[PDB]
Design a protein around this ligand. Structure first.
Ligand SMILES: *[C@@H]1O[C@H](CO)[C@@H](O[C@@H]2O[C@H](CO)[C@@H](O[C@@H]3O[C@H](CO)[C@@H](O)[C@H](O)[C@@H]3O)[C@H](O)[C@H]2NC(C)=O)[C@H](O)[C@H]1NC(C)=O
Ligand SMILES: *[C@@H]1O[C@H](CO)[C@@H](O[C@@H]2O[C@H](CO)[C@@H](O[C@@H]3O[C@H](CO)[C@@H](O)[C@H](O)[C@@H]3O)[C@H](O)[C@H]2NC(C)=O)[C@H](O)[C@H]1NC(C)=O
Lengths: 633, 124, 277, 651
């Protein structure tokens, strides 16, 4: 009756070109083009439109991109086989190829799926299905497929027409089969600390889970993160670069009068160098400050006597404190001014001629203006004279160049070490002064004292630390600025940027923030040498390394992955980590930074419940009789 | 690898016809594209004809259009070259060559696999 | 003259604790049917009409529903036949949520005279295909030769003569518990010996009657399923050689003396030496 | 009374020659100066970070545009990489003319600058915008320098994943200024966006990167697009605009889609909370691949009563349209959203960012604005009315009203008359009829001292192309003309391109040839002196070129209509010997992306050239120092000098 059909009036199947190559990007080549070039290429089997972009990079006319070409492909009679994303084995799916007819003829097309090993098809794969497709319309041909293999099965779907009008298309496409079970991610978090002894070496357990599918293993990756910045909020500074520029003064009067202008000018230059505030000033101010030191270096050379002894005038007898005070300054000016090295070598020779029998230093006649000496004038004058030459000979130790003065340099450090037998005896006595203890222990840590005679002056100085409010010190007082400034230079050598030095630096910054700045000589020079050493030490963070090494044994044999993280640019590293199984893993950690290790082991887990439609529901039942062809009995 | 064997060539006069053949071992012959080349003595390789990896469309050189015909049978792993109207300047060693899908046509260096080449000599 | 069949579609929800809203019904008909349009717009002009919009083109019916209940709600329609169907095969039907299309439900449905799912043999964790015509019982002497079929045209993997015991009926199959008489050749099951428990299964829709208590010769291809007791399990289908061994009333006769000698000399050549001389 | 002038851009880039301008001013006739200029590092004594270049200026040849070579070997040996706080360096001109004649304290005059290790241009594109997990990723980089020519310096590339961790790192030489590489996504990787960075090995601050998405997807067969009739909707209480949309639904290969379009509606806020409409759902049949849906005005106010709001509560917000069609025989579905259809108060957009500030009293104020359609193209033919109210200097305020239409691409240029001794200027700009867009602007006067003022006007307000010679006029306003010459310079891409002078005349003009060196953006800074005090003004002129120096045209000829597998001759045309990097990308990938990635066009190349632009604003200044450091210059005459800026902040 109404059962009109074709019966082997069809084409040969091998006369149909099979569509098999479906990329998503192609033409990925770089050609060398001398003005004009033709590339003769072949279009793939995907029926879309293509956007062909281009980029020209010439050595004479530079960079240029092209307006892209919309290239359109069209087969007019074709079938589209859109797969699902991933199908499991022993999960029945419906392949849906859709026939497309853009012609003006009522066609009759037989569609079959070619039988490939790895798929259980309807009837074994040899059976075909006819459907007639109208003109300008589209028709689907369903196929209920269940897979068998675990890897990949290349299936081919062939649609062929009759010889009344020869139409035909065939699509071969590889189906991806998901492994047995569901995915499972396991995070083994470990907070790293190679510093101290919290995790310098450790082991990691395995994962012989009874929920493991035995052949469904994946790769397991490692990733490591060093989340350790540095908070800037702990260094306000904010010392004014205008009152320091007022301290760049010309040397004026005699030997005393010059050094209350010259030594704050060098200490303003050495502060503004090491705090790097020459950008707030014109750069003419730097080369002005060189010429103030350049004229002032050979100004005191007029006052130099013929033995390395210094005084205010030539008729006045020489002072021991003033000769050490210029030797402290001109040693630091040897970097700026290329003066005579050996003339300063005989300057220290006069200071060794006044060596006492017990290790002290004695001044036969002092300076006239005793406000230049600062907080030295008091009951412990002999202690403050001895420790100040110890600072002065250590700064002048770098002037002793080559081997021509090195036998005299042995006589310098022997007179220092005999003075360390006298300064260490007064420091282990106990009751020193406030200023006299701060200049003593700073002189001991420069010239490398023995540590049993060094730390007993450390704890005796830290006992005198009366603090109030949120400040820590030893209306502005003029004498207490110098005592805090000598203690801040000593504290940065034992505990560099400590809990008290971060607050004691903020006290005398406020003392120099008054109108006029600092109000004498020694509280100006040493505190600008103290806050310059603090500003470097508060802006010098460099914690790095984090060496980490992992090693394992198993299916691969013995393999190991070593990696170092920290260049403080990258936020983390991840590697592939091809190790064995969930078994046998050794970790060795180095470096000195805080880290966070994460090991991501991924494998396949058990099946459990299907959970086949519990929210929405759909059911359909059909009854009746349909005519069929072929089959068997 | 997938290998190639040429046959069919020989001595012939001017204006005759000839059927070349290219046998192909291996299983993935339908995934590679083919092309007949030639090389004159003294000159380098040039293209005669080429056919798609699916056998759906053909390409011919500017002298080879109309006179020559390339065909592919993916069921027997064969490549043919139906030739007609021969000239004495067509005397060359005719090569059979294989290449990928994203390959160029005029570039001889971009094809992957090659045969040994057959000799077609046209006299007058 | 035109012919037609009738459908019945019933959906509901349990999603009062889930994602609510409206719904789109997306079903697939058979491979050569298209829906009758006048039966579908019967549910567009009613008061409690359920369907608010329809559009069909061939074997594909789209139905928009504005309300989903917790109880059974059924809509039936018809579809005519264009071409005869060349294969027994199910189809799908997917019910999407209208505001959240990734939350859906896809349930297969089968033929009215046949079953729903495809025929497969599932035991332990590994299943096996079970399609492809039906195995036939050959009698040969009442009606190709054995060595030609054993080595060259399917390459037969296992060789066994075996004794049939118990006939079960498990799901859509008919199982046969057996007992090995003589081991001839083995590919899988390396540890096969005599008097072992083997299950041979057959498709229950086929016409194959098997006689218990008698000894047959069964040759074919190995399977990937294992039985309930641990032995490898074998499938009777296409490319399987089913001949019963003749009784001693028949081979002691004079007419089948040289005819049984072809059968017994096959058991000694293939059982002790195997293929290729 | 005599001055030495020193100009440079405010940010030095290392490895790049630094353009240094030098100029004598108010110098006698028979005088020749000599000297040098170099980069100097303080706090490492005075070790130079550059070899010096000598300059010699006569009294008649009194200006010189120098090129100070900045090598990386001298910049590391002086100690700039070991510097603390921030990246600062000094440009120093050395001459004994300041000490042996002008009696100043040093033979040194200079300026404070910032230095940067960012140099060159790196461009890089990927194989795809979106990839499945387990797919090969191909990428290319392209190495160029400051002069937009291919560079050969050694670079380092790295690949950062979806969480932001380095999974691959290569350091490769550049003999041919390209680098192809391939790597594979892991099979079990999470979705996200990855980041391929490229950076020079000795240039530490070379940010250049693009991003690609990783997502599980199967490739679609058809792209769904939602196009409204207008990109806006008026929320005037007397009139509501219509809400009609067109859903074109076509395949990737050209032909329309036979299907049924299923539409849901809703509203969306700024946080991202979707509020759908229960009811009012649309289900339409596609004919010729399009579906014209319409939302009625009676249905719209009924849905707001269900959400207990009204028409006055639509001040912010946007109307959300989500559409998902189903192919009527195919059974294939794809989705599309529409998330940029805002409830607006006016159909036009005002952009007064091209209008300069700090303008000269006694000169015409140039009100230049840009009129654009709302979320659309610039519109022409729209009237703009400006109510200019000058505030009180001690007298009554006066109101001016000047109307002018927009010429081309929304460009309007309205000069208004500003007299002397202004206190401040208040603007009330109205544009469009009906329902106008408004903008208020208060600009401050220069302070009441007056050393002299300089006005810069532009007669041809059209944006010129490459090859157009543009004329500008200069008039000195508000002081005695004791000066003799004007001096100008052209700033482009953070360098000093050209520098010349022009003599003073009655109605003085100068012609500037717009070259291809002058970028899509260049500055014009001109100045003079009144005694010993500077008077300056500046102006920004954009160039609407948008063309390559060479060319690259791709063409597949014929009338198209190609089947699969056919031979295609791709034609390649270029002006020079060029390396041509090609790629043929699938347009169906653009529908599979959740956020559709925008690739590399020529417009991204021109905006990479203005990344080195050091100027902020249209130009001008109430001071003469504020003209220079808003243009990106540093300057010192010996007494007045510019402070160093704090990177590209510009508050
Ligand atoms: C491809 O096949 C279709 C059949 O599905 C062809 O369509 C049909 O065209 C005929 C034209 O005579 C239609 O017949 C008419 O029937 C109406 C019934 O009311 C009658 O009033 C007319 O006088 C005429 O006899 C027929 O209805 C129509 N089929 C359908 C389903 O509408 C189509 O023409 C074929 N294509 C080609 C290119 O031949
Ligand atoms: C230059 O390179 C650096 C590193 O090589 C990159 O810098 C930074 O990238 C992050 C991206 O997460 C930016 O962060 C953002 O923070 C804002 C909050 O202010 C947040 O709203 C954003 O969503 C984002 O998370 C960061 O600002 C940026 N810059 C710095 C100095 O850390 C980047 O590749 C390049 N930097 C720039 C500014 O282009």
């Amino acid at each position: 009756a109404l059962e009109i059909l074709q019966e082997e009036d069809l084409i040969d199947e091998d006369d149909i070109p099979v569509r098999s190559f479906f990329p998503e990007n192609w033409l990925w080549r770089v050609e060398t083009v001398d003005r004009f070039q033709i590339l003769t290429l072949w279009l793939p089997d995907s029926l879309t439109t293509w956007e062909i972009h281009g980029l020209s990079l010439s050595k004479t006319k530079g960079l240029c991109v092209a307006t892209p070409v919309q290239l359109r492909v069209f087969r007019e009679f074709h079938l589209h086989l859109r797969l699902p994303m991933s199908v499991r084995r022993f999960e029945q799916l419906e392949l849906r190829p859709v026939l497309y007819n853009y012609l003006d003829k009522n066609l009759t097309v037989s569609v079959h799926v070619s039988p490939v090993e790895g798929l259980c098809l309807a009837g074994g794969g040899g059976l075909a299905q006819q459907v007639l497709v109208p003109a300008g319309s589209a028709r689907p041909v369903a196929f209920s497929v269940v897979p068998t293999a675990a890897a990949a099965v290349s299936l081919k779907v062939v649609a062929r027409g009759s010889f009344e009008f020869p139409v035909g298309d065939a699509v071969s496409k590889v189906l991806q089969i998901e492994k047995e079970g569901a995915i499972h991610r396991e995070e083994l978090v470990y907070e790293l600390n190679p510093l101290d002894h919290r995790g310098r070496t450790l082991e990691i357990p395995g994962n012989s889970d009874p929920n493991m599918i035995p052949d469904g293993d994946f790769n397991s990756y490692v990733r490591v993160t060093a989340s350790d910045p540095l908070d800037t909020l702990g260094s306000e500074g904010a010392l004014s670069p205008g009152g320091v520029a007022s301290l760049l003064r010309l040397p004026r009067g005699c030997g005393e009068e010059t050094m209350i202008y010259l030594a704050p000018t060098l200490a303003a230059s050495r502060y503004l160098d090491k705090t790097e505030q020459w950008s707030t000033l014109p750069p003419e101010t730097k080369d002005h400050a060189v010429d103030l030191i350049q004229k002032g270096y050979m100004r005191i050379q007029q006052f130099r006597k013929a033995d390395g002894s210094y005084a205010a005038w030539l008729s006045r007898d020489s002072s021991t404190w003033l000769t050490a005070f210029v030797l402290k300054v001109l040693s630091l000016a040897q970097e700026q001014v290329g003066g005579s090295p050996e003339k300063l070598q005989e300057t220290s020779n006069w200071l060794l001629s006044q060596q006492q029998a017990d290790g002290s230093f004695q001044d036969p006649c002092p300076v006239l203006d005793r406000s230049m000496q600062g907080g030295l004038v008091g009951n412990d004058e002999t202690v403050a004279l001895t420790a100040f030459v110890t600072i002065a000979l250590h700064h002048g130790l770098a002037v002793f160049q080559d081997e021509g003065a090195e036998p005299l340099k042995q006589r310098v450090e022997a007179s220092i070490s005999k003075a360390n037998s006298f300064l260490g005896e007064k420091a282990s006595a106990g009751l020193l002064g406030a200023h006299a203890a701060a200049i003593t222990a700073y002189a001991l840590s420069l010239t490398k004292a023995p540590v049993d005679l060094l730390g007993v002056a450390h704890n005796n100085l830290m006992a005198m630390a009366q603090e109030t409010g949120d400040n820590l010190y030893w209306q502005a007082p003029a004498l207490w600025i110098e005592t805090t400034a000598y203690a801040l230079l000593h504290l940065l050598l034992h505990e560099g940027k400590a809990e008290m030095a971060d607050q004691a630096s903020a006290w005398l910054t406020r003392q120099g923030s008054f109108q006029g700045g600092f109000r004498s000589t020694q509280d100006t020079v040493i505190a600008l040498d103290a806050l310059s050493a603090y500003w470097i030490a508060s802006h010098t963070t460099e914690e790095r390394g984090l060496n980490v090494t992992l090693s394992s044994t198993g299916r691969n044999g013995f393999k190991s992955h070593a990696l170092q993280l920290n260049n403080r640019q990258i936020r983390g590293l991840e590697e592939e980590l091809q190790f064995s199984l969930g078994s046998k893993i050794n970790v060795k950690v180095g470096g000195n930074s805080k880290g966070t290790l994460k090991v991501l082991r991924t494998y396949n887990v058990l099946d459990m419940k299907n959970t086949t439609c519990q929210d929405l529901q759909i059911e359909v039942t059909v009854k009746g009789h349909v005519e069929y062809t072929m089959e068997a009995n | 690898q997938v290998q190639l064997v040429e046959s069919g060539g020989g001595l012939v006069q001017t204006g005759d016809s000839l059927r070349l053949s290219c046998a192909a071992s291996g299983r993935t012959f339908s995934r590679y594209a083919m092309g007949w080349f030639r090389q004159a003595p003294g000159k380098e390789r040039e293209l005669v004809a080429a056919i798609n990896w699916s056998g759906g469309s053909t390409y011919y050189a500017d002298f080879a259009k109309g006179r020559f015909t390339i065909s592919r049978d993916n069921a027997k792993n064969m490549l043919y070259l139906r030739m007609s109207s021969l000239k004495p300047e067509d005397t060359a060693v005719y090569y059979c060559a294989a290449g990928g899908p994203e390959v160029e046509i005029t570039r001889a260096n971009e094809y992957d696999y090659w045969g040994q080449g057959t000799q077609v000599t046209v006299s007058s | 003259q035109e012919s037609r069949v009738h459908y019945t579609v019933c959906i509901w929800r349990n999603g009062k604790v889930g994602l609510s809203g409206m719904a789109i019904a997306d079903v697939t008909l058979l491979s050569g049917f298209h829906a009758l349009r006048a039966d579908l717009e019967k549910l567009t002009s009613l008061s409690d009409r359920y369907v608010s919009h329809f559009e069909t083109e061939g074997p594909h019916v789209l139905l928009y529903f504005d309300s989903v209940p917790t109880s059974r709600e059924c809509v039936g329609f018809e579809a005519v036949q264009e071409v005869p169907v060349g294969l027994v095969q199910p189809a799908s039907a997917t019910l999407y949520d209208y505001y959240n299309p990734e939350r859906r439900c896809s349930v297969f449905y089968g033929a009215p005279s046949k079953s729903r799912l495809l025929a497969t043999l599932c035991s332990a964790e590994v299943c096996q295909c079970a399609e492809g015509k039906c195995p036939r019982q050959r009698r040969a002497l009442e009606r190709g030769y054995r060595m030609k079929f054993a080595c060259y045209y399917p390459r037969v993997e296992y060789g066994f003569q075996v004794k049939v015991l118990r006939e079960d009926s498990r799901a859509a199959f008919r199982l046969f518990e057996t007992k090995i008489t003589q081991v001839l050749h083995f590919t899988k099951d390396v540890k096969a010996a005599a008097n072992q428990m083997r299950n041979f299964l057959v498709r229950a829709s086929c016409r194959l009657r098997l006689e218990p208590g008698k000894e047959y010769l069964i040759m074919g291809l190995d399977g990937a399923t294992y039985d309930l007791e641990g032995h490898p399990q074998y499938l009777l289908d296409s490319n399987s050689w089913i001949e019963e061994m003749p009784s001693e009333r028949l081979c002691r006769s004079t007419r089948q003396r040289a005819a049984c000698a072809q059968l017994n000399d096959f058991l000694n050549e293939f059982g002790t030496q195997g293929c290729q001389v | 009374k005599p001055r030495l002038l020193l100009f440079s851009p405010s940010v030095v880039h290392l490895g790049v020659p630094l353009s240094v301008g030098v100029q004598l001013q108010d110098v006698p006739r028979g005088q020749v100066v000599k000297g040098s200029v170099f980069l100097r590092n303080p706090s490492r004594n005075n070790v130079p970070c550059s070899p010096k270049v000598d300059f010699t200026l006569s009294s008649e040849r009194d200006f010189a545009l120098l090129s100070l070579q900045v090598p990386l070997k001298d910049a590391k040996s002086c100690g700039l990489h070991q510097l603390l706080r921030g990246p600062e360096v000094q440009l120093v001109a050395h001459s004994p003319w300041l000490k042996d004649s002008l009696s100043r304290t040093t033979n040194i005059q200079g300026i404070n600058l910032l230095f940067s290790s960012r140099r060159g241009h790196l461009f890089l594109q990927t194989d795809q915008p979106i990839y499945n997990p387990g797919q090969r990723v191909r990428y290319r980089v392209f190495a160029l320098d400051q002069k937009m020519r291919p560079s050969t310096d050694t670079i380092t590339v790295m690949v950062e994943n979806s969480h932001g961790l380095r999974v691959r790192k290569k350091e490769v030489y550049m003999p041919s200024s390209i680098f192809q590489d391939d790597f594979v996504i892991p099979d079990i990787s999470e979705p996200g966006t990855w980041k391929i960075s490229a950076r020079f090995s000795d240039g530490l601050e070379s940010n250049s990167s693009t991003q690609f998405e990783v997502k599980k997807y199967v490739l679609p067969n058809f792209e769904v697009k939602i196009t409204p009739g207008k990109p806006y909707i008026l929320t005037v209480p007397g009139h509501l605009d219509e809400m009609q949309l067109d859903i074109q639904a076509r395949y990737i290969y050209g032909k329309p889609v036979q299907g049924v379009a299923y539409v849901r509606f809703g509203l969306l806020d700024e946080d991202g909370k979707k509020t759908f409409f229960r009811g009012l759902e649309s289900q339409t049949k596609l004919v010729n691949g399009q579906s014209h849906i319409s939302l009625s005005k009676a249905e719209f106010q009924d849905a707001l009563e269900k959400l207990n709001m009204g028409i006055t509560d639509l001040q912010g917000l946007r109307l959300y349209v989500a559409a998902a069609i189903i192919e009527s025989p195919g059974g294939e579905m794809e989705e599309a959203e529409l998330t940029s259809w805002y409830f607006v108060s006016s159909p036009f957009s005002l952009d007064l960012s091209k209008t300069k500030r700090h303008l000269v009293p006694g000169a015409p104020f140039l009100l230049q604005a840009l009129v654009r359609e709302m979320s659309g193209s610039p519109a022409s033919g729209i009237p703009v009315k400006v109510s200019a109210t000058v505030s009180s200097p001690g007298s009554v305020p006066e109101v001016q009203d000047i109307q002018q239409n927009t010429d081309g691409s929304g460009q309007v240029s309205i000069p208004i008359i500003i007299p002397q001794t202004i206190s401040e200027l208040q603007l009330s700009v109205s544009a469009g009829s009906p329902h106008p867009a408004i903008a208020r602007l208060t600009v401050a006067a220069p302070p009441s001292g007056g050393p002299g003022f300089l006005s810069i006007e532009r007669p041809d307000s059209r944006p010129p192309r490459v090859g157009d010679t543009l004329n500008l006029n200069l008039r000195a306003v508000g002081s005695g003309a004791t000066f003799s010459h004007y001096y100008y310079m052209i700033l482009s891409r953070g360098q000093i391109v050209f520098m010349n002078r022009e003599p003073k005349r009655t109605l003085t003009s100068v012609s500037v040839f717009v070259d291809h060196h002058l970028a899509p953006s260049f500055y014009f800074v001109a100045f003079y002196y009144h005694g010993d005090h500077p008077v300056a003004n500046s102006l920004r002129v954009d160039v609407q070129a948008g063309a390559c120096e060479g060319k690259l045209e791709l063409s597949v000829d014929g009338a198209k209509q190609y089947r699969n597998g056919e031979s295609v001759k791709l034609h390649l045309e270029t002006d020079s010997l060029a390396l041509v990097a090609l790629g043929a990308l699938d347009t169906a990938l653009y529908a599979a992306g959740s956020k559709s990635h925008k690739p590399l066009n020529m417009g991204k190349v021109f905006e990479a050239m203005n990344s080195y632009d050091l100027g902020c604003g249209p130009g001008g200044g109430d001071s003469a120092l504020q003209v220079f450091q808003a243009a990106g210059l540093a300057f010192s005459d010996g007494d007045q000098w510019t402070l160093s800026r704090k990177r590209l902040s510009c508050p």
